[PDB]
């Protein structure tokens with residue numbers, strides 16, 4: 001009876017196995033755009049993905065991860081609110097059963113159809129497992145998805161999903177370029193938070209882009225054909241794998257833009 005997103009194992013239950021669920025810097029949050037403060041000291045975000053070496057895509061039973069070789073400084077995030085260099089380890093999404101929900105962060109209570117998380121670890125801690133034990137261990141670049149025109153840079157991901165329909169399936173996924181998932185603008189909001197999935201560790205500097213990307217209804221429909229279950233188990237679609245907004249508590253959200 002492990003954690004998941006259902007009535008009996010979903011977000012309202014997680015605190016029993018992971019008491020930090022009720023902690024002081026939990027994610028996601030609602031981004032109140034009028035309360036967020038413009039911070040002219042914030043730097044432009046530096047996203048240097050030219051040498052990203054994607055390796056594999058995995059259905060882990062909660063979402064799917066596009067994994068990267070993080071054994072060298074090849075795909076790194078710096079600048080913005082960050083001190084030092086953070087290396088890309090994986091990306092994944094959270095999405096809904098319907099276009100009106102799916103994002104984890106919200107903007108003035110608006111829910112997007114999905115949310116992309118590009119997960120990076122601080123190179124001062126040497127790898128991911130050590131980084132997650134530190135309050136400045138991770139930086140996640142969060143990007144909202146709305147349904148409209150297709151995102152051509154997403155299609156290579158969509159087309160491999162048939163091969164990882166079920167939990168524990170992986171496929172080689174090389175030469176994928178995550179630059180094709182970004183939006184024009186790197187304007188962002190930032191705040192200190194946590195993993196949005198168990199173990200919910202309070203180790204993340206969140207960097208949420210203001211500009212969503214557009215994906216087509218056909219693209220998100222293919223996300224919703226995935227399975228939480230492993231092969232030869234009763235079908236439970238892959239949908240609504242999002243944690244709701246958590247209390248902001250004693251935090252300030254800062255904006256990079258006026």
Ligand SMILES: C[C@@H](NC(=O)c1ccc(Cl)c(S(N)(=O)=O)c1)c1ccccc1O
Pocket residue numbers: 060062063065117119138140194195196197198199204
């Ligand atoms: C579900 C999946 N989670 C991640 O891989 C994950 C890692 C880092 C971050 Cl920062 C995030 S997030 N959503 O905050 O961006 C999610 C998972 C797999 C295996 C064990 C535990 C576990 O949580």
Ligand SMILES: C[C@H](NC(=O)c1ccc(Cl)c(S(N)(=O)=O)c1)c1ccccc1O
Pocket residue numbers: 151152153154155156159179180
């Ligand atoms: C639709 C997809 N297209 C691209 O990945 C793609 C091709 C050219 C370009 Cl320029 C881009 S872009 N501008 O989004 O970075 C993206 C695709 C291209 C070739 C084979 C399979 C595919 O799914």
Ligand SMILES: [Zn+2]
Pocket residue numbers: 092093094117196
């Ligand atoms: Zn996530």
